[PDB]
Design an enzyme around this catalytic site. Structure first.
Site, PDB file in Angstrom:
ATOM      1  N   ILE A 124       9.478  17.837 -35.214  1.00  0.00           N
ATOM      2  CA  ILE A 124       8.514  18.874 -35.559  1.00  0.00           C
ATOM      3  C   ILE A 124       7.148  18.305 -35.954  1.00  0.00           C
ATOM      4  O   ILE A 124       6.088  18.857 -35.601  1.00  0.00           O
ATOM      5  N   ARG A 125       7.187  17.198 -36.688  1.00  0.00           N
ATOM      6  CA  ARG A 125       5.985  16.492 -37.095  1.00  0.00           C
ATOM      7  C   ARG A 125       5.099  16.261 -35.868  1.00  0.00           C
ATOM      8  O   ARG A 125       3.899  16.533 -35.885  1.00  0.00           O
ATOM      9  N   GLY A 176       8.774  19.319 -41.495  1.00  0.00           N
ATOM     10  CA  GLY A 176       8.348  17.943 -41.591  1.00  0.00           C
ATOM     11  C   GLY A 176       9.221  16.868 -40.958  1.00  0.00           C
ATOM     12  O   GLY A 176       8.838  15.693 -40.968  1.00  0.00           O
ATOM     13  N   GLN A 177      10.385  17.219 -40.418  1.00  0.00           N
ATOM     14  CA  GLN A 177      11.173  16.188 -39.745  1.00  0.00           C
ATOM     15  C   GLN A 177      10.486  15.782 -38.437  1.00  0.00           C
ATOM     16  O   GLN A 177       9.678  16.534 -37.895  1.00  0.00           O
ATOM     17  N   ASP A 178      10.826  14.586 -37.950  1.00  0.00           N
ATOM     18  CA  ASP A 178      10.063  13.872 -36.925  1.00  0.00           C
ATOM     19  C   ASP A 178       9.719  14.699 -35.687  1.00  0.00           C
ATOM     20  O   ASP A 178       8.539  14.807 -35.304  1.00  0.00           O
TER      21      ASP A 178
END
Lengths: 550, 129, 159, 139, 159
Positions: free
Chosen positions: C57-58, C53-55
């Site tokens: 990867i998002r 969920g970090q940016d």
């Protein structure tokens, strides 16, 4: 138990094709549960759930019908496009069985507004006349709600309402007469006709009697045209049925404002009517009382006295004891006050906490209310100061002081002075403020101010800002009124206490500078006795009346 | 006052040693003579994963200490101490240990060595490179 | 059954997955990437794609959208500052054509924490009531205890 | 038209297992629960048909783990109120198919909700006949 | 089978429904609301939602769209002033996503009246020829006689 969001949401399937009476009824039960358990619905999901449910009215099952009535009333206000459900309710309402009949009228009428009023009327007329109490009473309460939306529709129902009134069935009558009184009213006289018709009758309906007593309690002599007496042959002035509440309501009004005068079989000027019911169980509470009575509460007071006084002394049960104090209070008066005061003194021994504060307030309060001398009131006010020492408050300093300067002031300050010997800083801001304010204002020559000053000086150090600020300003006024005093003002004010704290400093800098520096035109002007900041009424006594049997 | 907070059930044999992981104190590993060292969490009675750290039962478990060192060591009575990386789950190397059953093995933190002891009365120090 | 599990970083997505797969509570690192695992529940084999969920990867989730039968959206119920952000991510996810008919399961997670928002509160904040085009459900969970997890797998399997 | 202020059936803490408000004076949960705690504190651990709280006669009874309430006016007496409270206890018992305890109420939350609405309607006493209520309601 | 029957006020929707349910010609009132009834024809049970056509109610039909398998659109063939209005209502109804695959059956009704427009005329005025995305049919009816009603139920059942 539940989550409001999940249940409000899953309800939306009804709006489509699925109707499933079991599933939907459950989902509805859950809605009622969310409210009951204590939760608040979310508006979008609520609005959606409401439009969905109306489809569910197609299936006629008594449990589903029931769920539907409670849920639409609760969800009605937090929902939109609710109007669709009226038809479905009428369909349900005409369906014979009490499950539908009564509960529908109530749900329908709640949602119903003046446009819709017209629709429900045929079904309403049919439901009101019922001697089956559910249908009729629900329809009668329903009509009461409808008087708001549209008066005129409801009024036509007066004939069906009257028809129910003739029942001796308790509900049908209570509702019928109660509602009628509200409905038909266009003038006093038409309501009065409704009441006289039932009035001659010996009902077996206590509720009808009660609701009616209230209408009746004032003298009505125009009931059904005219009549020669305020007469109520239904217990209000009569005692046709005995039952301690009805008996109490009736007896207190009639005695000194006749609804009718005394009859051998129905006392109504004499004190008796309450008193024959007076020795009893828990029931006694209505019975034992009084209020008004011929010519005073006092000849009345003696009957009942054994009951009220033994429970009040014995029972350290809160529930009994409260009834016993209210009952003592009721049998009370000017005369009774000797007796009432010993009992109230005694009472705190049973329940002593707030109840303690209340009895020491009550004994003073009763002395002010019912005169046993104003002095005695002050002496009781000392006992209040002694016993509690803190449940006196700020409003007490103003009320005690204002009251005191009617007569007591020299004594009060002096008493206060003694009272101040108590406890240096647990005595509170308020007592220090009272000895301080009174010593400032009187400017004792009745006792030497030096004891007072010495007592106050210690209290200030370790007590709140408002009193320390109070103490400097008082001292200044004390200076202006009495020249003698100025030397004490100076030792006190230079101290880190009565000046140079915070608030105390600011006020002090002003008050000091005006005394020290300035002309004292201002200081002189300012002291007119050295009086309080406001003069209210005598607050304590009413407060005390309700507070004691809680 | 030494109430039983949690009970861990996982090991099917004699639990020789327990050590707490210094990167999450909620984690510990326990070595049992069941040829595994099982990494457990406090929250979970059961071992949340198992490592098969040795082949002749695991006498000891230790972590190689630090904020960035996910390591296990196993000692066993097969004369050998084994190094494992808990991050990768592989066995980094096998240490000769001793010339007799390795009683215990541990990691020195500062120095790159492993210090092991054996029932032959000998302690050996091995360079961890 | 093919499942995509996403949510902001630290919501508890990997904790959930390995609790389900291992019955164990593991010590996670931030997932720069995905974890993919198969879990058996009641005759269904769920293939769960846990995507970090970090940016950075998002920005990559959209490659995992296609073929997704159901979506687990994990929320940290204790983090009130990021709930709006979660709402924003999830709303445009709902607009994705590859996600068009996928079953939508929200996990309000870390329910174990004293100030955790309730599932109802979360439902209001995420705007869940306004989804009329497909199946949704919200479930309070605690991934460390395991609470609500299988109630989730249950709901999902009834798509 | 008004007798009954509110009906509450409370666990032995004063917390809301149930309350349905025939007053408009408690609709919000915080205050409905406060009321409930207030009436339960006075009335409890002294069982009688009388209590005086908030200047209103409160009539109450008890069971194993509940105290059952009618709050009504104090211009009346216990007995009028008691007739409502007896209906409340009785009707729930016969309805649920088990005596009023926290367990019976929870067992059938629906029977309880429906049964109480028939007894009181917006503070007027709609029904007071336990038998009538029970037939009137469908589980 | 789930059926939504709508049309402007006075087209004959309730007359149609109760002719079908009761074999009777009832004396209608304007429907402020809906009527919902179940009708048996040849082993199909049609649940028909007759939703009132006056303006206030017209604004509410969209709540009955969802789950609709077929749509009966009733037209008063004798009313030429309101045919355009019917056309306008029906056209945007055709644009409704919940009505996307529903079978479209037009009843040109009151065919019994001397100057009734023909079904062909009505077909041109309503723009029926331009529907290529789903099944449509037009049927001349007289709800009072019963003429064309069951030919409608027949066509509908062959969706």
């Amino acid at each position: 138990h539940l989550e409001k969001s999940a249940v409000l949401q899953e309800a939306r399937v009804f709006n489509e094709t699925p109707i499933n009476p079991r599933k939907c009824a459950h989902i509805l039960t859950k809605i009622l549960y969310l409210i009951n358990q204590g939760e608040h619905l979310g508006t979008t999901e609520a609005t959606e759930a409401f439009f969905a449910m109306t489809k569910l009215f197609q299936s006629n099952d008594p449990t589903l019908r029931r769920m539907c009535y409670l849920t639409i009333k609760e969800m009605s206000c937090i929902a939109e496009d609710v109007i669709i459900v009226t038809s479905s309710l009428t369909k349900d309402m005409t369906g014979k069985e009490d499950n539908y009949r009564g509960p529908a009228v109530r749900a329908l009428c709640q949602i119903t507004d003046s446009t819709m009023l017209q629709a429900v009327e045929r079904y309403m007329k049919q439901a009101i006349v019922d001697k089956v109490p559910s249908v009729s009473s629900s329809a009668l309460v329903s009509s009461l709600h409808l008087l708001k939306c549209s008066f005129d529709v409801v009024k036509r129902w007066v004939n069906e309402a009257q028809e129910a009134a003739s029942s001796d069935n308790i509900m049908v009558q209570y509702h019928a007469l109660g509602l009628l009184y509200h409905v038909r009213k266009n003038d006093r006289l038409a309501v009065s006709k409704m009441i006289s018709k039932f009035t001659r009758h010996g009902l077996k309906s206590p509720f009808a009697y009660c609701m009616m007593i209230r209408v009746a309690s004032k003298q009505l002599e125009e009931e059904d045209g005219s009549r020669d007496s305020p007469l109520f042959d239904f217990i209000e002035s009569c005692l046709r049925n005995k039952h301690e509440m009805v008996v109490y309501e009736a007896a207190s009004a009639i005695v000194n404002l006749p609804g009718c005068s005394a009859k051998e079989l129905a006392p109504a000027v004499s004190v008796l009517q309450l008193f024959c019911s007076s020795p009893k169980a828990a029931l006694r509470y209505a019975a034992v009382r009084t209020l008004n009575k011929v010519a005073m509460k006092h000849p009345s007071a003696v009957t009942a006295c054994n009951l009220d006084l033994e429970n009040l002394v014995t029972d350290s049960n809160r529930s009994i004891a409260t009834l016993a104090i209210t009952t003592l209070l009721k049998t009370g008066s000017e005369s009774s006050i000797d007796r009432l005061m010993k009992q109230i003194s005694s009472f705190m021994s049973e329940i002593s906490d707030e109840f303690k504060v209340v009895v020491v307030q009550a004994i003073s309060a009763l002395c002010q209310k019912y005169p046993r001398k104003h002095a005695v009131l002050m002496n009781f006010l000392f006992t209040m100061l002694r016993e509690e020492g803190g449940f006196e408050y700020k409003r007490a300093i103003v009320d005690c002081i204002i009251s005191i300067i009617e007569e007591n002031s020299e004594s009060k300050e002096t008493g206060l002075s003694h009272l101040c010997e108590f406890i240096e800083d647990c005595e509170f801001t308020v007592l220090a403020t009272r000895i301080l304010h009174l010593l400032g204002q009187e400017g004792p020559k009745t006792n030497n101010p030096s004891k007072y000053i010495r007592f106050i000086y210690n209290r200030v150090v370790l007590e709140h800002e408002e009193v320390r600020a109070g103490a400097v300003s008082a001292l200044a006024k004390f200076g202006a009124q009495n020249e003698e005093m100025l030397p004490s003002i100076l030792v006190l004010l230079k101290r880190c206490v009565m000046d140079d704290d915070n608030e105390v400093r600011d006020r002090a800098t002003f008050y000091l500078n005006v005394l020290e520096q300035k002309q004292k035109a201002l200081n002189a002007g300012y002291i007119l006795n050295g009086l309080t900041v406001s003069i209210p009424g005598l607050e304590k006594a009413l407060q005390q009346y309700t507070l004691e049997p809680s | 006052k030494w109430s039983c907070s949690q009970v861990f059930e996982g090991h099917t044999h004699y639990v020789m040693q327990i050590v707490i992981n210094p990167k999450d104190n909620n984690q510990f590993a326990s070595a049992s003579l069941d040829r595994t060292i099982k990494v457990w969490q406090l929250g979970s009675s059961s071992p949340n994963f198992t490592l098969e750290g040795h082949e002749k039962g695991v006498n000891c478990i230790d972590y190689y200490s630090g904020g960035d060192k996910p390591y296990l060591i196993s000692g066993a009575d097969d004369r050998l101490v084994k190094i494992w990386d808990y991050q990768n789950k592989t066995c980094v190397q096998t240490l000769e240990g001793h010339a007799q059953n390795v009683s215990c093995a541990s990691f020195h933190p500062e120095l790159p060595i492993i210090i092991t002891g054996s029932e032959d009365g000998t302690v050996r120090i091995w360079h961890s490179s | 059954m093919r499942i995509l599990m996403v949510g902001l970083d630290g919501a508890g997505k990997t904790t959930v997955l390995y609790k389900l797969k291992l019955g164990e509570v593991i010590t996670t690192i931030p997932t720069i990437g995905f974890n993919v695992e198969t879990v058996q529940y009641k005759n269904i084999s769920f293939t769960v794609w846990d995507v970090g969920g970090q940016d950075r990867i998002r920005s990559l989730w959209r490659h995992y959208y296609r073929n997704t039968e159901g979506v687990i959206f994990v929320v940290d119920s204790n983090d009130r500052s990021r709930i709006g952000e979660a709402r924003e991510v999830m709303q445009r996810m709902l607009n994705e054509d590859e996600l068009r008919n996928a079953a939508w399961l929200v996990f309000a997670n870390k329910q174990d924490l004293p100030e955790a928002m309730s599932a109802a509160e979360i439902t209001e904040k995420l705007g869940l009531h306004s989804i009329r085009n497909r199946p949704w459900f919200i479930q309070a969970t605690c991934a460390t205890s395991g609470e609500g997890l299988y109630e989730g797998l249950e709901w999902l399997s009834n798509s | 038209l008004y007798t009954v202020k509110a009906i509450l059936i409370l666990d032995n803490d004063g917390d809301r297992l149930f309350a349905k408000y025939y007053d408009d004076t408690y609709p919000s949960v915080k205050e409905q629960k406060a009321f409930e705690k207030n009436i339960f504190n006075k009335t409890h651990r002294t069982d009688s048909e009388i209590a005086l709280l908030e200047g209103l006669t409160v009539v109450y009874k008890s069971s194993i783990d509940l105290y059952f309430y009618v709050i009504g006016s104090s211009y009346e007496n216990e007995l009028m109120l008691m007739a409502v409270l007896n209906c409340l206890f009785d009707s729930l018992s016969q309805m649920l198919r088990k005596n009023v305890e926290k367990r019976a109420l929870l067992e059938n939350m629906e029977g309880l909700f429906l049964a109480v609405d028939e007894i009181v309607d917006g503070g007027v006493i709609l029904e007071s006949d336990p038998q009538q209520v029970v037939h009137r309601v469908a589980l």
